[PDB]
């Protein structure tokens, strides 16, 4: 895989080659793969390879990454969240 | 103990391309 | 995602933004998402987003969180289990 | 070696609400 | 969940409350849950709760647990494997 | 880096009981 | 499971007994199991056990392994990718 | 915090054999 506009990865704190979970709001499919960076400003969200069997152009999805940390750190942890609308316009 | 926490997410992005044949 | 009454989170030791597995006793579906805290006393269990395709209002589910630790500590580890009945009545 | 253990669980809770269009 | 004869857990090095993957050879279903100990010598393999939707009495399954360790340790690691036949007779 | 390794397994055990209604 | 030609394991940095994810490009199925080493030069990719329900002889698949590391190291991490064509010809 | 990253992958290999009755 899933090439994602580098700007989007930056906003969510997601790294290239990092494992990501993709939850399809449109069809309900849930799968895991890894992130690839697409050129900045391209606004690309491309599901490639076997992943192409789980998502289609037009589908609305949620892309998430998880990290591990000690319990004390976990209690004060704040996730990096980016919300989108329209033509993958960030807010 | 170690916890698994949501690091971050892209909420409701729209898929713009699908390539069954590589990029993989 | 899954908003859970904060009293429930406290009892099971589950944190907000933590990864949780949801096993549906009613339809047999099993999926993973993350916890969101709902207002105390509300007795709320809300499956939001893409997860709404995996559970319906009225479904009985088991929500669990997993943690990692050295083998020596795992030997004596004890999980936090909360039992429910009726309309989300913690017994 | 590190083990993955059950931290806790809510046994047999009822889903009270489902919101597919949630944006939060 | 899956109550497993404590002797079986001992042979495989699996702990109570440890996360386990169950792969059904009979129907092809693959799910994850956690282990519970059944009394020694009982030879019990019981799929309880939501897991009961993935396995039936008579089904042949493979139960596995995974642990993490540094790369150097990983290269010399030897898994604890137990093979069964007949009435859950270990070999 | 940390690897995820097979710790051990019960190869081809037969399920002896199924309880949809608890034990969970 | 999944026996893989040892030459392939070496190239991708995948170890024997390590967890691997198998994404089926042909049927779209995605599952997890562990790696077993097959004889060098055999060009073997064998899906054994319950996994035989998820892939058939002739299916194109992508096999991947994931590791964990501190965020600072993850920033410059580079995966080991091996490309194939024809009858498991490593290009 | 600890990240989960792709270690390596075999891109587009063909399944040569499938053995459902395997006991090893």
Sort A76 into a burial class: Cβ within 10 Å, 0-12 / 13-18 / 19+. Answer: exposed
- Per the CB < 8 A criterion, the answer to whether G69 and F1 are in contact is yes
How many C-beta atoms lie closer than 10 Å to residue A59's C-beta? Answer: 20
| 3-class state of residue B1 by DSSP | coil
Look at B17 and A55 and tell me if their CB atoms are within 8 Å.
no
D15 CB neighbours in chain C (<8 A) are 45-47, 55-61
The DSSP H or E segment spanning D9 is: strand D2-14
The rounded distance, in Å, linking the Cα atoms of D4 and C65 is 10
C19 CB neighbours in chain D (<8 A) are none
- Per the CB < 8 A criterion, the answer to whether F6 and G32 are in contact is no
- Which residues on adjacent β-strands are paired with residue B17? A46
Per-residue exposure over E38-76, b if at least 16 CB sit within 10 Å of its own CB, e if not: beeebbbbbbbbbbbbbbeeebbbbbbbbbbbeeeebee
Of G15, G34, G68, the CB nearest to F2: G68
Q: What residue of B is the nearest CA neighbor of H2?
A: B4
Q: How far is CA G34 from CA A10, A34, E75, G75, in A?
A: 33, 19, 14, 27
Q: Report all structural domains of chain A as residue ranges with CATH numbers, in order of start.
A: 1-91 (2.40.40.20)
Q: What residue of F is the nearest CA neighbor of E3?
A: F23
The candidate with the shortest Cα–Cα distance to A80, out of A7, A3, A2, A26, is A7
Look at B17 and A44 and tell me if their CB atoms are within 8 Å.
yes
The candidate with the shortest Cα–Cα distance to E25, out of G45, G36, G54, G22, is G54
Gap between the terminal Cα atoms of chain D: 37
CA C84 to chain centre: 12
- Per the CB < 8 A criterion, the answer to whether C49 and A23 are in contact is yes
B1 CB neighbours in chain D (<8 A) are 5, 7
- Which residues on adjacent β-strands are paired with residue C20? C33
Do the annotations mark residue C51 as ligand-binding?
yes
Of D7, D9, D18, the CB nearest to C52: D18
DSSP annotation of A30: E
The rounded distance, in Å, linking the Cα atoms of E33 and E53 is 13
C46 has catalytic annotation: no
The rounded distance, in Å, linking the Cα atoms of H1 and H24 is 37
- Per the CB < 8 A criterion, the answer to whether A12 and A66 are in contact is no
Look at C17 and B4 and tell me if their CB atoms are within 8 Å.
no
List alpha helices for E27-85, DSSP H. 71-75
DSSP annotation of B20: T
DSSP annotation of G18: B
C68 CB neighbours in chain D (<8 A) are 2-5
DSSP annotation of E26: T
How many C-beta atoms lie closer than 10 Å to residue A50's C-beta? Answer: 24
CA H19, H20, H21, H24 dihedral sign is positive
How many C-beta atoms lie closer than 10 Å to residue C86's C-beta? Answer: 9
The rounded distance, in Å, linking the Cα atoms of C3 and D22 is 11
CA C50, C52, C53, C59 dihedral sign is positive
The rounded distance, in Å, linking the Cα atoms of H12 and E36 is 39
The candidate with the shortest Cα–Cα distance to F24, out of C60, E50, A46, is E50
Q: What residue of C is the nearest CA neighbor of E50?
A: C25
The structure tokens listed for D10 are 């809510």
DSSP string, G26-78: TT--EEEEE-EEE-TTS--EEEEGGGGGT--TT-EEEEEEEEEEEHHHHTT--
Look at G18 and F5 and tell me if their CB atoms are within 8 Å.
yes
The rounded distance, in Å, linking the Cα atoms of G47 and G90 is 19
CB pairs under 8 A between B and H: 7
CB pairs under 8 A between C and E: 30
The DSSP H or E segment spanning E34 is: strand E30-34
Look at F4 and E44 and tell me if their CB atoms are within 8 Å.
no
Sort A39 into a burial class: Cβ within 10 Å, 0-12 / 13-18 / 19+. Answer: exposed
The DSSP H or E segment spanning A40 is: none
| 3-class state of residue G7 by DSSP | helix
Q: How far is CA E62 from CA D10, E9, E28, E78, in A?
A: 27, 13, 11, 18
The candidate with the shortest Cα–Cα distance to A61, out of C20, D18, D20, B10, is B10
Look at C19 and B4 and tell me if their CB atoms are within 8 Å.
yes
The rounded distance, in Å, linking the Cα atoms of G46 and H15 is 6
């Amino acid at each position: 895989x899933c090439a994602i506009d580098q700007d989007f990865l930056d906003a969510a704190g997601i790294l290239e080659n990092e494992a990501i979970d993709i939850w399809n709001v449109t069809n309900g499919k849930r799968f895991s793969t890894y992130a690839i960076a697409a050129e900045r400003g391209s606004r690309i969200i491309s599901v490639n390879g076997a992943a192409a069997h789980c998502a289609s152009v037009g589908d609305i999805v949620i892309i998430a990454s998880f990290v591990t940390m000690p319990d004390e750190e976990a209690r004060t942890w704040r996730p990096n969240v980016a919300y989108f609308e329209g033509d993958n316009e960030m807010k | 103990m170690i916890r698994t926490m949501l690091q971050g997410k892209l909420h409701r992005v729209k898929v713009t391309h699908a390539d069954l044949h590589y990029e993989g």
